Amino acid sequence: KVFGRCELAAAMKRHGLDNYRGYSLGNWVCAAKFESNFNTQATNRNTDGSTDYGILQINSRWWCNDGRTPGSRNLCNIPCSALLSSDITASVNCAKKIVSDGNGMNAWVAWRNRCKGTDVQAWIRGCRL
């Protein structure tokens, strides 16, 4: 599924991401835009052999099991394919655990480089929330 901007904002809000660990909704929508272009089916392979999955590009080295990242962890206790669903529940639940692990949203490279320190509220403007 390719989400619309406001559609994703509303889904994220319903799942409790607005102000989660102090990150306003626009931060999450901004991160999803530049991580995956709002596409739940996005995958990208990393040089170390891990793969990033889903709308928030969650990495198999630590967070999910894809059966082909040897010596990796599965901290969200999910198969990585669950992160590609049109239902973002699994991605959101795993993101909550990532953002709580000490480094906040800096765990998302695209957030740090393209959202952090910008007018992130612009990503939810005009949306009915």
Q: Please answer whether residues 36 and 5 qualify as being in contact, where contact means their C-beta atoms are separated by less than 8 angstroms.
A: no
Here the contacts of 88-93 (C-beta below 8 Å, separation 24 or greater) are 88/8, 88/11, 88/12, 88/15, 88/40, 88/55, 89/15, 91/40, 91/54, 91/55, 91/56, 91/58, 92/12, 92/15, 92/16, 92/17, 93/15
Contacts of residue 70, defined as CB under 8 A and 6 or more positions apart, other chains included, come to 49
Spot the catalytic one: 7, 18, 48, 52: 52
Indicate which technique resolved this structure.
X-ray
- Measure the CA–CA gap between 25 and 94, rounded to whole angstroms: 16
Backbone angles phi, psi at 93, to 5 degrees: -60, -40
* CA torsion angle 48 56 34 13 (round to 10): -160
CATH number at residue 59: 1.10.530.10
CB atoms inside a 10 Å sphere around CB 81: 15
Note down the domain range covering 63: 1-129
Backbone angles phi, psi at 71, to 5 degrees: 75, 15
- Note if 87 is an active site residue: no
**Given in angstroms, what resolution was this structure solved at?**
1.7
* Domain count within the chain: 1
- Measure the CA–CA gap between 99 and 21, rounded to whole angstroms: 7
Spot the catalytic one: 35, 48, 66, 87: 35
- Note if 35 is an active site residue: yes
Residues at the annotated binding site? 101
Residues at the annotated binding site for substrate? 101
